Amino acid sequence: ELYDHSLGTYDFDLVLMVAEKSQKDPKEYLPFLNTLKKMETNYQRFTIDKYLKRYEKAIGHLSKCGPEYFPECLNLIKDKNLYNEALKLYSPSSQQYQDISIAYGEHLMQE
Amino acid sequence: SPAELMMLTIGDVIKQLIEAHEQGKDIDLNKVKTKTAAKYGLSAQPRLVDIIAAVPPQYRKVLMPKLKAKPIRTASGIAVVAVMCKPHRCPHISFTGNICVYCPGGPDSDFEYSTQSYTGYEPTSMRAIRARYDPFLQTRHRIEQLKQLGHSVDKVEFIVMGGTFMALPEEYRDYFIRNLHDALSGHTSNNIYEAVKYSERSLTKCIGITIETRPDYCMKRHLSDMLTYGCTRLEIGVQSVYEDVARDTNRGHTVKAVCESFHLAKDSGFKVVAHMMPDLPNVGLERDIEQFTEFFENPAFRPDGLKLYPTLVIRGTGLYELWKSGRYKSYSPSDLVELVARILALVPPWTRVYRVQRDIPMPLVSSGVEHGNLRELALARMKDLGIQCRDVRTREVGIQEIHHKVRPYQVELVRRDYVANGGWETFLSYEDPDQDILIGLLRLRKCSEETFRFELGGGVSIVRELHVYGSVVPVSSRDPTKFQHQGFGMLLMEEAERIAREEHGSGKIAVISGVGTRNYYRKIGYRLQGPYMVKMLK
Amino acid sequence: LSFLPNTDVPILACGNDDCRIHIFAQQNDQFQKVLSLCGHEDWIRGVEWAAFGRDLFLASCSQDCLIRIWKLYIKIRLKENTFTIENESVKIAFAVTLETVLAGHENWVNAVHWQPVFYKDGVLQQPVRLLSASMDKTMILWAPDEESGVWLEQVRVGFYDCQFNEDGSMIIAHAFHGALHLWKQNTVNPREWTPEIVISGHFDGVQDLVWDPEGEFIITVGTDQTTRLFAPWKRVTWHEIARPQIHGYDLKCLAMINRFQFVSGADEKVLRVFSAPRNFVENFCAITGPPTEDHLLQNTLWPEVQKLYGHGYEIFCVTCNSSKTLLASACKAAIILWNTTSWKQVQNLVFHSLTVTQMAFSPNEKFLLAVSRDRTWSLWKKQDEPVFSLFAFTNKITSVHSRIIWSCDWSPDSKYFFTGSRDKKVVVWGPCSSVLDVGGAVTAVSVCPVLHPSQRYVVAVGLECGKICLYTWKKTTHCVETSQSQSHTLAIRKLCWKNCLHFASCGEDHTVKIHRVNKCA
RNA sequence: GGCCCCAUGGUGUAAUGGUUAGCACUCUGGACUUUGAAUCCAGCGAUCCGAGUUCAAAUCUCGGUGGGACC
Numbered sequence A: 001e002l003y004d005h006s007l008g009t010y011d012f013d014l015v016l017m018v019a020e021k022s023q024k025d026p027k028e029y030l031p032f033l034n035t036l037k038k039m040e041t042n043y044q045r046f047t048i049d050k051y052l053k054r055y056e057k058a059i060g061h062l063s064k065c066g067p068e069y070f071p072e073c074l075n076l077i078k079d080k081n082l083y084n085e086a087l088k089l090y091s092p093s094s095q096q097y098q099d100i101s102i103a104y105g106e107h108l109m110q111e
Numbered sequence B: 001s002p003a004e005l006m007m008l009t010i011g012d013v014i015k016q017l018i019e020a021h022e023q024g025k026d027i028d029l030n031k032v033k034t035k036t037a038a039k040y041g042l043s044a045q046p047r048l049v050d051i052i053a054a055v056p057p058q059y060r061k062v063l064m065p066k067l068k069a070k071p072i073r074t075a076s077g078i079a080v081v082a083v084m085c086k087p088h089r090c091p092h093i094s095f096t097g098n099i100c101v102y103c104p105g106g107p108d109s110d111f112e113y114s115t116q117s118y119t120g121y122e123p124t125s126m127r128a129i130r131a132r133y134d135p136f137l138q139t140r141h142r143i144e145q146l147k148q149l150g151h152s153v154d155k156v157e158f159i160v161m162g163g164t165f166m167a168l169p170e171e172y173r174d175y176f177i178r179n180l181h182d183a184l185s186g187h188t189s190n191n192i193y194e195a196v197k198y199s200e201r202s203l204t205k206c207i208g209i210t211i212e213t214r215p216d217y218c219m220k221r222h223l224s225d226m227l228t229y230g231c232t233r234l235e236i237g238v239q240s241v242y243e244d245v246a247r248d249t250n251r252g253h254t255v256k257a258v259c260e261s262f263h264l265a266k267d268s269g270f271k272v273v274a275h276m277m278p279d280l281p282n283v284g285l286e287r288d289i290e291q292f293t294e295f296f297e298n299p300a301f302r303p304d305g306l307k308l309y310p311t312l313v314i315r316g317t318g319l320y321e322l323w324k325s326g327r328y329k330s331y332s333p334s335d336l337v338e339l340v341a342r343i344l345a346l347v348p349p350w351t352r353v354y355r356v357q358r359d360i361p362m363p364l365v366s367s368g369v370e371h372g373n374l375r376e377l378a379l380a381r382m383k384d385l386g387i388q389c390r391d392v393r394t395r396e397v398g399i400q401e402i403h404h405k406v407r408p409y410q411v412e413l414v415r416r417d418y419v420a421n422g423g424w425e426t427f428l429s430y431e432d433p434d435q436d437i438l439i440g441l442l443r444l445r446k447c448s449e450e451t452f453r454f455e456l457g458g459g460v461s462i463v464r465e466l467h468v469y470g471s472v473v474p475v476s477s478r479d480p481t482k483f484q485h486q487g488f489g490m491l492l493m494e495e496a497e498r499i500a501r502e503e504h505g506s507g508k509i510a511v512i513s514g515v516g517t518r519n520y521y522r523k524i525g526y527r528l529q530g531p532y533m534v535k536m537l538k
Numbered sequence C: 001l002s003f004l005p006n007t008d009v010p011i012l013a014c015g016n017d018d019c020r021i022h023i024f025a026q027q028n029d030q031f032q033k034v035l036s037l038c039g040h041e042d043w044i045r046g047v048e049w050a051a052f053g054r055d056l057f058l059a060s061c062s063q064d065c066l067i068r069i070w071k072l073y074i075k076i077r078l079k080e081n082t083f084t085i086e087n088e089s090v091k092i093a094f095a096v097t098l099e100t101v102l103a104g105h106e107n108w109v110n111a112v113h114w115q116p117v118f119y120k121d122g123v124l125q126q127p128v129r130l131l132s133a134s135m136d137k138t139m140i141l142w143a144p145d146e147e148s149g150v151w152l153e154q155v156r157v158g159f160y161d162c163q164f165n166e167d168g169s170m171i172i173a174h175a176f177h178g179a180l181h182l183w184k185q186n187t188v189n190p191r192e193w194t195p196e197i198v199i200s201g202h203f204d205g206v207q208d209l210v211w212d213p214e215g216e217f218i219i220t221v222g223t224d225q226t227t228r229l230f231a232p233w234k235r236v237t238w239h240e241i242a243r244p245q246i247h248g249y250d251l252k253c254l255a256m257i258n259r260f261q262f263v264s265g266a267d268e269k270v271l272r273v274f275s276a277p278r279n280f281v282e283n284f285c286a287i288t289g290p291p292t293e294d295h296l297l298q299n300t301l302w303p304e305v306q307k308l309y310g311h312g313y314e315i316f317c318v319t320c321n322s323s324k325t326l327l328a329s330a331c332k333a334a335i336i337l338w339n340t341t342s343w344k345q346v347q348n349l350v351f352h353s354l355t356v357t358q359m360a361f362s363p364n365e366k367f368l369l370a371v372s373r374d375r376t377w378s379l380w381k382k383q384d385e386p387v388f389s390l391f392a393f394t395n396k397i398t399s400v401h402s403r404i405i406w407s408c409d410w411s412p413d414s415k416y417f418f419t420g421s422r423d424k425k426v427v428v429w430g431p432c433s434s435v436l437d438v439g440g441a442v443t444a445v446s447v448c449p450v451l452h453p454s455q456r457y458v459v460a461v462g463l464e465c466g467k468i469c470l471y472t473w474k475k476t477t478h479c480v481e482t483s484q485s486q487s488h489t490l491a492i493r494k495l496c497w498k499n500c501l502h503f504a505s506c507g508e509d510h511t512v513k514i515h516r517v518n519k520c521a
Numbered sequence D: 001g002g003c004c005c006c007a008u009g010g011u012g013u014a015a016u017g018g019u020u021a022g023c024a025c026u027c028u029g030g031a032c033u034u035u036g037a038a039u040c041c042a043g044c045g046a047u048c049c050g051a052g053u054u055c056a057a058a059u060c061u062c063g064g065u066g067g068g069a070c071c
C-alpha cells in the first residue's frame, strides 16, 4: 500500500527504493515505469490517478491536459457517473459545459 | 462428464469470489454454491476441499481467512502432529504371559498388524500401516495433509504413540529421533547431536516432544537421557490410588514408585499427565468418587495434565471372560453421566483436561457406550445441576469464542500457589474474570532441596512451562488483531524473574525450552548451559 | 568458485544458512569479504556460475521455493552494486545486479545445473539451457526466448538432484531412495523423452542370498524389507528382474524349496512360503528363451501359500535339506523341524542354552550340525521320520573356540566339518588339523563343491573387515586373496558357490559382487 | 397451432384456503491433543413469474416464462 502511495506521491525515486523490497520482477515494472516516465507530465498525472482510481484528480488533470481528450474524459465521467464533478471543472458558455449537462440529465437518468 | 461440470462450477465460483475481493465485496459461499450448482444442473453441493484445491497462490495469500476448514485444529494456538512407533512387547511379560488384565491386543494378540493398547483401526493406525511405521514418510504425509486445509505450520509439536519407548534398544530410538528432527530440518545427519545443532537454525521452529512411560523407567539416568532429546511432558498411567488394585489388575508395581517418580520428575522440571480409570472391578461408585476427590485433595499428587478413560470390556482379555461369566458389571449410561458431571466440578483451576473416552471402533466393545460424545452430555447434566467447571481447555479464548462467541473485555493478572511433592509451586496468569476467559499462563516453582541436576544446586528456581493460547501466528507476522504478539510474555518473564529474585531468594534462573525456542530467550539475554537455558540473577 | 572475467583472479560466492550470499576475492593473495546479497529468505540450497561472454550470470536454487539470477559485469535505471578490485596496480570496477526472478515450483528447490558447453566440431557454443529439481517430483527445464524477459518453461516431465548430459540429450536423476530415473531426449520431437534402463541395489544392506540349482538367477534379501531376483540379460549383462514381495517388518532369513518356491524369515514368529506366479514365469522364459524402474514394483508380486507358527520368539536362522524333505529353523531356546508337504512338526530339540546361530544339513543327508552362541556345537544322528539322537557334542571345555562361533560347513562327501568364530580360529574335523589362524575375525566360511584329484581341499573365508582371503588344506595353505579393488568395506555375510569358477559375495556394504577364478587354478 | 400436463431446498420428493412446507439425498460444525471421510449429535437449503380474486391464497382464475406428447 505504501508503494502505491509512493506512486501517488508523483516521484519516481521514492517508488524505486520502496519497490526494491517489493519482490516483484524489475523486468515487469521497470519497462512499464520507464514508459510512464516518458509520457506527458499532466498526462502522467491523469494516468497515475486513473491507475490509482483517483478519478477526481484524473479528470482534473486531463481537463487542463488538452481539450482534445475531453470526449474521452466524458466517457470516464459517463462510465463513473462523474458528471457533477466535471460541472465544476468546466464553465458556462462552454459547449463542453452544455454537452456534459445534457449527458448528466440523460445518461444517469436511465429509467 | 459431470466431473468437468463441477470443475466449471468451481472455476466460476473462483472468478466470482476473486472479483468480489478486488473491489472488497462480501459474498456468502453457500449462496454462490447453490446458484452455480443450480445453473449447471448439479444434483449435489460442491466439496470445500476441492474449492481450496484450485486457488492460485497470488490469491491463496489472502483468501485463506475465508477458506480454512475446521478452525479448531488451531483454536489452541499450536499445531499438533502425532507419530507411531514400531510394535513391540511390554517389559513386565518377563514374568508371565500378562500384558495387563484390561489391555487390548498386543504384538501377538490375534491381530495381523496392531500395537499394544491399540486395535489398529485408528486413522493414525492406518497412516502408520501405510508408512510401514517409517517416521519421515508419515510425518511428511501428515504435515502435507494438514497444510492442505490452509493452516499455517509456523509452530509445530510432536507426540509419539506406541506401547513402551524406554524399553527399546538405544540405537533404534536414536535413529528414530534423528529421523524426526531431519524431517523438519531437511538436513541429512549422522547422530543425534548433529541433527540437534542443525534443527537449532531451522525455520519449522519445533517446540518440544512428549513421551509415555511407566514408573519402572523413571530413574535419573533415563531423565538425563530424555534431557538430550528435548522432551517436555510425560505419560505414566496411574489407574488407581489404591495399592491393592495394582496387584488386582496385575499392574506389576507399586503406587509408591509412582509417587516418587512424580516427585523426582517435578524436581527435574518436566510436565506430567496422568491416566484415570473409572469403573474398575471391586470398586464401588462411592469408591470412585472418593479416590477422584483424593486425587486433588492430597498434596502428594496434585498433577498437571489429566486424562480419563472409562472401562471398556473387550474380547481377548481376562476381563472379557470375567464379564462373560457375569461377574464384572458396568454402570448404566446415566450413572456414567452423573459420575463425569460430579468429577468435572472438582478439577482445580490449574489442571487442564485433554481428552475424554477412548477412540475404539464401536462394533467391538461388549460394554461400549452408545455415545461417541460424552463431554457434551456431561455439560448438559451440569447445566441441569447448575454447577460449572473451571478447566483450562474450557476457559481459553479459542474454545470459548468458537463455542460461545465471547470477546474478552478486561484482562488482568492472577497469582496462586500450593504445595505438591514437597514443591513450592506457583501459577501465574492473565485472564478476563468476568467471562472467566483466559489468555496466558505460567508455571514456576522453587527447586527441591534434593535434586539430580547439579546445575540447579543452590540459588536456582526452575520455570517448568509458559504458554499463551489462541491460534497460530507466523513469527514474522505481527497483528492479525488477536492476542499472540502484544508483548504479553515479556511482562510475565520480568515479573517471574522479580519474584524469584526476591521471594524465592535464589541467585540464578534456569528454564527448559524447545530446541527452536532457545533463540527467543536469546532476545532477553539468556544463555545456554547443557540442555537448559539460564540467566544470572545478580 | 569462479574467476574474474578476462583474467585469472579467483572469486568465490558462498551461501550460508542466514538467507543471504557472501562473496570473496583473492586479491593480495587472500580472499576478502567483498559483498553480500540480501535476496530471498531461506537456506541457500545451491549456487552456480555461468560465464556468458564478457559477463557472468549466477543461478541460485533456493530453499525459499524461488530462483533468483544476478550477473557480474565490468565497469530510468535501478541501483546496481559495484566495487573496485586491485589487479597489478589497476582498480578494475565490477558491477552486479539482479537479472531475473523465476518461480515455477512449490516445494524446496534442490539443484540447478547449467547446460555444459561443448564442441560443434571445434565450435564452442554457449547454450543457456538450465535444469531444476524440487521435492514435489517436478522437473522444469527453464529457458529464455528472443524477447522472454521472464524465462519460458518447457516440458515438465516428472530426488535431491537431477544431473545433466554434456550435449544435453541425456538426463538423469535419483529417486528419493533406492532406484533412480534415467531419461533421454528423442530426435523426432524436441519435446520427446524416453526412460532408460539403470542398475540398482538393496541400498541399505543384504543379509542372505541363494544360488538357483539351474544356475541362471539368484535371489537376495536385505534389511530394506525387500527381495530381489537377478538374471543375465541378452541382446551379456546380469540385471535385477523381480521384487517378489515387500514386507512390513525386516527380513533376515532365506531358504529355497523348489523350482519356484522358497521360504523367508522375518522379525515375526511366522514362516512364509512363496511360489512364482505364472505371468512372471512366462516373461522370464521369454527372455531366457528389460524391466523398467516403475513397472517392476507394479507387476512383480507373488502369492503366499502357507503360514507357520510355533517359535516363541522371532526366527533367527533357516535351512533346508538337499533332498528337500525337512527344514531347520530356530528363534532366539528350541529347535523346530518341518515336513515339506505336511508343513507340521516332525521332531523338536531343546538342547542348547543360548541363541542358535547356524545349521548345516549333511550333504549326504546323514547328519545335521548345529552351531550356537554358547560356544558349543551339537550333532544329531538320524536313525533308520527317524529321530535325531545326539551322535556327539561338546561341553564348555571340549569346545576349541574361546569365543562365539559364527559359521560352519560340511565336506563335499560329508567327511569333515569346519567352524569359524570371532576369535579368528579355524579348525578341521574328530579334529584332525592344527589351528589355521589368519589373524582376522571369521565371519563366513565355505568349501569347493568338488575336490581336485590332488585332493587339495580349498576354502573361501570371509573376514570381518571386508577382506576376502582364500586358503587350501589337504589332509596332512594360502593360495590367493582379494585385491584392494575387489575388497568390501564391511563384514561378510554369506559366501555361496555355483553348483551344477564362480561364487557369491554378499557383503554388508549393500553390494552384491560376483567373482570368477581360473578353472584350472 | 391449439389442446392438455409440469414447475417445492443444490437434487429426489410429501404436504395444502389459514399463524409454522415434512421428509430424503447433499453440504457444514462439535465431539477430537489419534478422524475432512468413521459414530453420534447439531446446523444451513426452497413452492417459475406477473396479474387477479378470497378476511385470508402455492393450492380457485387469468396472463407470462420455460419444459414435456397429440394431428
Ligand SMILES: CCNC(=O)CCNC(=O)[C@H](O)C(C)(C)COP(=O)(O)OP(=O)(O)OC[C@H]1O[C@@H](n2cnc3c(N)ncnc32)[C@H](O)[C@@H]1OP(=O)(O)O
Binding pocket: B077, B078, B155, B205, B207, B208, B466, B467, B468, B475, B476, B478, B483, B484, B485, B486, B487, B488, B489, B490, B512, B513, B514, B516, B517, B519, B520, B521
Ligand atoms: C517452549 C516451547 N513451547 C512454546 O513455544 C509454546 C508456543 N509459543 C508461542 O506461541 C509464543 O512464543 C508465546 C506463547 C511466547 C506468545 O508470544 P509473545 O506474545 O509472548 O511474544 P512477544 O509479543 O512478547 O514478543 C514478540 C517477539 O517474539 C518473536 N517470536 C515469536 N515466536 C518466536 C519463536 N519461536 N522463537 C523466537 N522468537 C519468536 C517474534 O518474532 C517477536 O519478535 P518481533 O520483535 O519481530 O515482533
Ligand SMILES: C[C@H]1O[C@@H](n2cnc3c(N)ncnc32)[C@H](O)[C@@H]1O
Binding pocket: B102, B103, B104, B117, B236, B237, B238, B239, B275, B276, B277, B309, B310, B311, B312, B314
Ligand atoms: C492410555 C491409558 O489407557 C489405559 N488403557 C489402554 N487400553 C485400555 C483399554 N482397552 N481399556 C481401558 N484402559 C485402557 C492404559 O492403561 C493407560 O492408562
Ligand code: MET
Binding pocket: B117, B162, B163, B164, B212, B213, B214, B215, B235, B236, B237
Ligand atoms: C499406553 S498405556 C500407558 C503408557 C504405558 N504403556 C504404561 O502403562 O505405563
Ligand code: SF4
Binding pocket: B090, B099, B100, B103, B104, B116, B117, B163, B164, B214, B237
Ligand atoms: S503397560 Fe500399558 S501398554 Fe503395556 S500392556 Fe500394560 S496397559 Fe498395555
